[PDB]
Amino acid sequence: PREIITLQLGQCGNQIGFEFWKQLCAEHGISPEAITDRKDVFFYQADDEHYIPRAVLLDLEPRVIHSILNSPYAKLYNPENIYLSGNNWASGFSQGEKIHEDIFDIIDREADGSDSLEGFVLCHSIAGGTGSGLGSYLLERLNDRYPKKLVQTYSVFPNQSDVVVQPYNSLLTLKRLTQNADCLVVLDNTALNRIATDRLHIQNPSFSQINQLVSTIMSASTTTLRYPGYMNNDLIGLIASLIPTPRLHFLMTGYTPLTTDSVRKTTVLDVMRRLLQPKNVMVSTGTNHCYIAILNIIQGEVDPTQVHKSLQRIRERKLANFIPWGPASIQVALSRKSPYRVSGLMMANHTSISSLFERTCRQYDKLRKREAFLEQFRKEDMFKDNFDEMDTSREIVQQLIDEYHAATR
Ligand SMILES: Nc1nc2c(ncn2[C@@H]2O[C@H](COP(=O)(O)OP(=O)(O)OP(=O)(O)O)[C@@H](O)[C@H]2O)c(=O)[nH]1
Ligand SMILES: [Mg+2]
Numbered sequence: 018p019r020e021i022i023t024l025q026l027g028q029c030g031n032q033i034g035f036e037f038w039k040q041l042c043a044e045h046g047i048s049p050e051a052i053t054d055r056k057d058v059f060f061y062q063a064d065d066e067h068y069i070p071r072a073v074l075l076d077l078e079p080r081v082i083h084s085i086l087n088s089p090y091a092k093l094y095n096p097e098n099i100y101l102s103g104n105n106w107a108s109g110f111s112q113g114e115k116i117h118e119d120i121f122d123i124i125d126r127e128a129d130g131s132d133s134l135e136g137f138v139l140c141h142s143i144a145g146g147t148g149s150g151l152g153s154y155l156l157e158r159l160n161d162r163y164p165k166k167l168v169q170t171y172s173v174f175p176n177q178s179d180v181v182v183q184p185y186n187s188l189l190t191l192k193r194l195t196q197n198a199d200c201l202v203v204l205d206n207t208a209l210n211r212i213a214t215d216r217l218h219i220q221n222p223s224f225s226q227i228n229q230l231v232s233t234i235m236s237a238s239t240t241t242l243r244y245p246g247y248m249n250n251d252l253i254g255l256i257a258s259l260i261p262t263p264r265l266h267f268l269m270t271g272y273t274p275l276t277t278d279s280v281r282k283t284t285v286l287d288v289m290r291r292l293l294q295p296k297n298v299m300v301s302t303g304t305n306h307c308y309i310a311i312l313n314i315i316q317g318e319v320d321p322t323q324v325h326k327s328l329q330r331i332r333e334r335k336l337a338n339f340i341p342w343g344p345a346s347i348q349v350a351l352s353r354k355s356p357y358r359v360s361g362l363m364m365a366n367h368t369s370i371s372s373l374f375e376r377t378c379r380q381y382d383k384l385r386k387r388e389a390f391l392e393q394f395r396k397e398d399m400f401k402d403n404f405d406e407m408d409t410s411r412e413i414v415q416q417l418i419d420e421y422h423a424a425t426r
Contacts, residue, residue: 019251020131021058021138021242022124023072026152028081029142029173031074032224033204035085036232037140038070038093044236044243044355050092054355055245061095061130069095071127075120077102077112077147098123106186107394109150113158120155121162128163135252136167136199140235143190144175144183153193160197167253169200171235174373176206182390184380185404191374192407194267195414200256201267202238203370204231205300212299216275234270234299237314237362244353258348259310259366264417267370269300273361285319285359286327289349292363293336305422306369307338311347316360319351342426371418374411381408 025034042049045056051067060068074094076082079101085091086099100120102112113120128134137159141148159168172194175183194201209230213222241249249255260266273288275297291297292313315324328347331337339345354360384390385404420426 018055018057019133019135019242020071021135021252022127022131023059023070023138023140024075024124024155025072026075026139026141026155027145027148028076029145029224030140030148030152031076031081031085033171033173033228033231033235034072034074034140035088035090036225036228037235038072039090040232040236041070041239041243042090042093043357046355046357047093049090055243058242059239061127069093071131072098073123073127074099075147075151076100077109077151095127098127103150104146105182105394105396106146106150106153106189107397107399109146109148109152109186110154110189111150111397113151113154117158121158125162134166136169137163139168139170139172139198141170142173142175143187143194144180145186148173149186149190153190153197156193156197167199167256168197169202169252169256170194170198171202171204171231173204173231174206176210182384182394184377184384185390185394187377188381188407188411189404191377191414192410195264195410199266200260202234202364203267203269203300203373204234205269205373207301208299211301212275216296230272230299233272234362237272237316237360238270238364240314240316240352240354240362241350244355246352249350249352255312255364259312259364261309261343262417264414265309265366265421267414267418268364268366269298269370270365271298271363273297274358283358285315285323285361286330288315288359288361289313289324289327289331289347290336292361293331298363300370300373302369302372306367307340307422308347309340309366309368309421311337311339311363311365312350313347314350314352314362314364316352316354317358319359321351324349324351340421340426341424368418368422371415374415374418378408378411378415 025031047068141152209227213219213227273291
């Protein structure tokens with residue numbers, strides 16, 4: 018009975034968000050407006066026996082939000098939750114301070130509506146301006162206006178440019194994602210593509226097509242909260258299981274049934290089996306590294322006897338290389354689906370996730386060791402360098418994540 022409020026920022030933020038609410042709606046049998054599962058967690062009971070999502074659509078430009086509003090779901094969202102006011106993280110981190118008040122009026126209100134709020138989900142992108150700039154700002158404010166309230170995020174990492182400063186905004190955000198966020202579901206645009214392109218066969222994969230994937234995961238990873246059971250009914254119940262120590266709290270995901278249309282047999286076996294095949298992992302990396310915990314959420318019929326049998330085959334084929342300094346264990350979670358074949362979702366805190374952070378700095382340093390485009394960011398309270406404060410921090414994240422693969426740990 019724990020509520021979750023969702024903050025959607027920037028195009029990226031608000032587009033994976035649109036899809037997100039399109040997906041959950043389908044499941045809970047809600048129409049683009051209104052109507053045993055737990056809807057409360059993500060929805061609110063309208064003053065007309067109808068439904069509306071606990072979502073805050075924030076953007077610094079009208080284009081994207083009006084597409085949603087001039088769409089089939091315009092009637093779903095809570096009108097007073099839609100806010101509209103730069104390209105730079107500085108410009109984004111900026112206006113937030115400017116829009117602060119106007120924003121929390123919507124944030125604190127939904128914050129009231131909830132009786133037992135757990136925390137916040139922030140959909141957004143790391144590159145870009147608003148998502149990172151405004152988003153980093155919120156992540157700092159949220160960490161004060163609500164100190165106990167947990168914070169998770171679905172952060173979209175850029176593909177592999179055409180922004181020029183992605184490596185800037187990105188570092189400046191990864192910081193606020195390291196210390197001002199409890200859980201960090203990492204969505205790698207590169208990885209999303211490969212799939213869309215490969216395991217789907219689309220030469221020029223669009224964002225709609227790409228976001229269709231993200232919705233699936235954004236959707237699956239929250240099934241145990243919406244079709245609740247005895248164990249795993251708190252968001253903190255999931256994250257806790259995936260985060261032994263702080264900082265190290267960046268996860269990577271993956272889904273099994275991705276294509277086709279018949280097979281001879283598809284059991285939970287080849288479902289857990291594939292979730293470890295990196296080809297299905299939505300992140301890009303390039304011995305040593307190992308998982309720090311693994312979760313698998315299977316939907317539909319399963320009979321927990323078969324599951325023990327699947328783990329064993331893994332233990333002997335050594336398919337999963339876990340940490341050396343502790344209990345190598347993967348958690349399964351047999352969740353339901355909505356009343357409308359198997360299906361599996363993996364969420365892991367794996368070491369090589371440091372790879373993306375590394376891939377970002379090298380780009381940063383390079384662009385930094387030339388004082389590149391520093392003219393636009395230094396255009397508002399960047400009369401020195403918070404930049405350095407961030408790099409160092411991010412380096413810490415790469416330091417512990419690697420140090421995490423050492424038996425010493
Ligand atoms: N998966 C996914 N990635 C996206 C989507 N839209 C943008 N991105 C990525 O996210 C970044 C773009 O953020 P937008 O550019 O979407 O948002 P911020 O709002 O950029 O920009 P400004 O408001 O102009 O400051 C780039 O790294 C894009 O590759 C989307 O719908 N889905
Ligand atoms: Mg934008």
